[PDB]
């Protein structure tokens, strides 16, 4: 019975019932884990066994974080999260650090347990129920539900936000420079000190916390070769928007003209100062493609002119925190991926290109997921909200392995799309 604190009420969005999502297959290696970490949570009684009588459900799976080599249970509370919401956006929204993006070194702390110490609203508990697969379906599933604020549920941080703001009041007053943001199960701490100092300061916060019972994971650092642990910190500076460009041909076959006509045409939607007529003229009659058309000075006049318009920020762009976020990803080629984050069609807030993780094993699924997580992390720092993903992949395939390479406490909202190479504008070069 963890805390004397009085339970805060929550009621899912009107005319909407709780989650009734099925449990996807889990691989031994995960069940085993998912069991042990559920058996023990049951004893400390943060969780409680339950049977059929509870009509709701949500799925669970676990990921062995490479970050700490310690398995972490993960409940896909996206439906439930959606259902319940006057809560975390309107009622107890947690403000955003204008300047978290502005730091040069930010780290994420998994402050999940901090939650296992607050009683979950009495009535609202039927909703967080989940189940556990058994290999070869040897026995029925093992259902349970939460009694304390749950992990990865938009409500926790909102509810805990009170005690969290207290636990950090000191650290922040004694260290006014550091900036701290909380998004669900994580703590975003960013500084402007040398990396060596940051590491320290972060390692020191991991203390001030511990003095409060909030224990955070033990990220390991190996002394053999790939010093992966060197990338733990985020640096919102190599964060550079990637505008579009129009290649350069010494001479331009017919082909070359058209392609560049379309791109220039598409882009017109983004930036409205793109003209094509005085440039497309050079293509007037049904001619062979392979023909080396020469660039009029009337034409070239704008070819290089239009490009000048592609080297800058967009037209009266703004970010409305009241709308959802969307992100698009196009498998560009040989490990390369590019994306755009927008709320309104053709009025993006960002573009860029996740290059690649050298250990991408030449796996587009793996790389893709990683791009997602990556892109997701950015959105959180920058605007403080997760974007809905338009995933360049076939549902059924993505659903088969996204977990395997997933290494995050949260899960973003996604959908699938088969939309071929529209123009090459979403630029490859």
């Amino acid at each position, epitope marked *: 019975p963890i805390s004397p604190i009085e339970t805060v009420p929550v009621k899912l969005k009107p005319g909407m019932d709780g989650p009734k999502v099925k449990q996807w297959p889990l691989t031994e290696e995960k069940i085993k884990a998912l069991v042990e970490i559920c058996t023990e949570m049951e004893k400390e009684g943060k969780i409680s066994k339950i049977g059929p009588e509870n009509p709701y459900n949500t799925p669970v799976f676990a990921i062995k974080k490479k970050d700490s080599t310690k398995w972490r249970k993960l409940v896909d509370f996206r439906e439930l999260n959606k259902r319940t919401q006057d809560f975390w956006e309107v009622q107890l929204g947690i403000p955003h650090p204008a300047g978290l993006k502005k730091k040069k070194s930010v780290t994420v702390l998994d402050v999940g347990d901090a939650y296992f110490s607050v009683p979950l609203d009495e009535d609202f508990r039927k909703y967080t129920a989940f189940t556990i697969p058994s290999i070869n379906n040897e026995t029925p599933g093992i259902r349970y539900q939460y009694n304390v604020l749950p992990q990865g549920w938009k409500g926790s941080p909102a509810i805990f936000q009170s005690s969290m703001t207290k636990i950090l009041e000191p650290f922040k007053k004694q260290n006014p420079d550091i900036v701290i943001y909380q998004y669900m199960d994580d703590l975003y701490v960013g500084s402007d000190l040398e990396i060596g100092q940051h590491r320290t300061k972060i390692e020191e916060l991991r203390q001030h916390l511990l003095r409060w019972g909030l224990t955070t994971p033990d990220k390991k*650092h190996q002394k*053999e*070769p790939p010093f992966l642990w*060197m990338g733990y910190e985020l640096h919102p500076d190599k964060w550079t928007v990637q505008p579009i460009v129009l290649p350069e041909k010494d001479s331009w076959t017919v082909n070359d003209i058209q392609k560049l006509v379309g791109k220039l045409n598409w882009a017109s939607q983004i930036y409205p100062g793109i003209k094509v007529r005085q440039l497309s003229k050079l293509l007037r009659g049904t001619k062979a493609l392979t023909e080396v058309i020469p660039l009029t000075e009337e034409a070239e006049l704008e070819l290089a002119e239009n490009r000048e318009i592609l080297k800058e920020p967009v037209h009266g762009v703004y970010y409305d925190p009241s709308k959802d976020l969307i992100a698009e990803i196009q498998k560009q080629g040989q490990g390369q991926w590019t994306y755009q984050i927008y709320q309104e069609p053709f009025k993006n807030l960002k573009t860029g290109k996740y290059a690649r993780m050298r250990g991408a094993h030449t796996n587009d699924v793996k790389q893709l997921t990683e791009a997602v997580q990556k892109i997701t992390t950015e959105s959180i720092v920058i605007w403080g909200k997760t974007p809905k993903f338009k995933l360049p992949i076939q549902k059924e395939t993505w659903e088969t392995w996204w977990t395997e390479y997933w290494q995050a406490t949260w899960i973003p909202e996604w959908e699938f799309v088969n939309t071929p190479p529209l123009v090459k504008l979403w630029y490859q070069l």
Partner: antibody
Framework: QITLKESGPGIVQPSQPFRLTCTFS??????????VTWIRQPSGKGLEWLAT???????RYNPSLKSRLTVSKDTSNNQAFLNMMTVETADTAIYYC???????????????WGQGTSVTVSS | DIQMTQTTSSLSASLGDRVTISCSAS??????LNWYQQKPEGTVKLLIY???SLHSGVPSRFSGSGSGTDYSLTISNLEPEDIATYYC?????????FGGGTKLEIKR
């Protein structure tokens, strides 16, 4: 401004322990990437690795001598030591202590060295 | 116990010359090789880290190269201070290991 200085007994009696003290300045044994390594070099022969003591204390030993070697520090005084047990004549060599640092995801090197101490085993 | 070898033991060149030394590993140590310069006195300095990168304040006439198991140090054009023993250390898996050094002498 970084510097390291090996301290030692110079000459040790066969099958007795000896203890090298590496006093440095210009970095702490706290700053994340850091660590001290102890290299050995017998008279006229080449460099041999002994051990490296890291800031997290995930010290790693030369397998061929772990049973005798033992590394440690006193981060407050900026010293790092190395104790060798039951030394034999073969242990006679010049000992270096170097400042090893893991800079990035791919770089780890013993950037600065001392001058070494001359430890000789002879009764 | 990843054996590091420098075939050429004692090599002798002359001022002006350009030389290259061999450091062959026992496995694809993935460019996790460092280069050291021990001058006849006895002090050891860092030249190259990560097969090819240059340590601060190290003459440009210094170059590193190698891949997987074969690596090489190339001194552009000799000077009087370059004429001393050379060491390559592999830091891809403890225990760490250095070559056997390559004595760089002066042909007379």
């Amino acid at each position: 401004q970084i510097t390291l200085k090996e301290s030692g007994p110079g000459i040790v009696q066969p099958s007795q322990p000896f203890r090298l003290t590496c006093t440095f300045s210009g970095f702490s044994l706290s700053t994340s990437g850091i660590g001290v390594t102890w290299i050995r070099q017998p008279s006229g022969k080449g460099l041999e690795w002994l051990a490296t003591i890291w800031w997290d204390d995930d010290n790693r030993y030369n397998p061929s001598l772990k049973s005798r070697l033992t590394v440690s520090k006193d981060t407050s005084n900026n010293q790092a030591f190395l104790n060798m047990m039951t030394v034999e004549t073969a242990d006679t060599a010049i000992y270096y202590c170097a400042q090893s640092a893991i800079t990035s995801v791919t770089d780890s090197a013993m950037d600065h060295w001392g001058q070494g101490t001359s430890v000789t085993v002879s009764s | 116990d990843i054996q590091m070898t420098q075939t050429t033991s004692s090599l002798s060149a002359s001022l002006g010359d350009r030389v290259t030394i061999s450091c062959s590993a026992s496995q694809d140590i993935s460019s996790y090789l460092n280069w050291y310069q021990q001058k006849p006195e006895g002090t050891v300095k860092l030249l190259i880290y990560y097969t090819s990168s240059l340590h601060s304040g190290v003459p440009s006439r210094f170059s590193g190269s190698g891949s997987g198991t074969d690596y090489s140090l190339t001194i552009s054009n000799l000077e009087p201070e370059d004429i001393a023993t050379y060491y390559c250390q592999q830091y891809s898996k403890f225990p760490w290991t250095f070559g056997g050094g390559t004595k760089l002498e002066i042909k007379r």
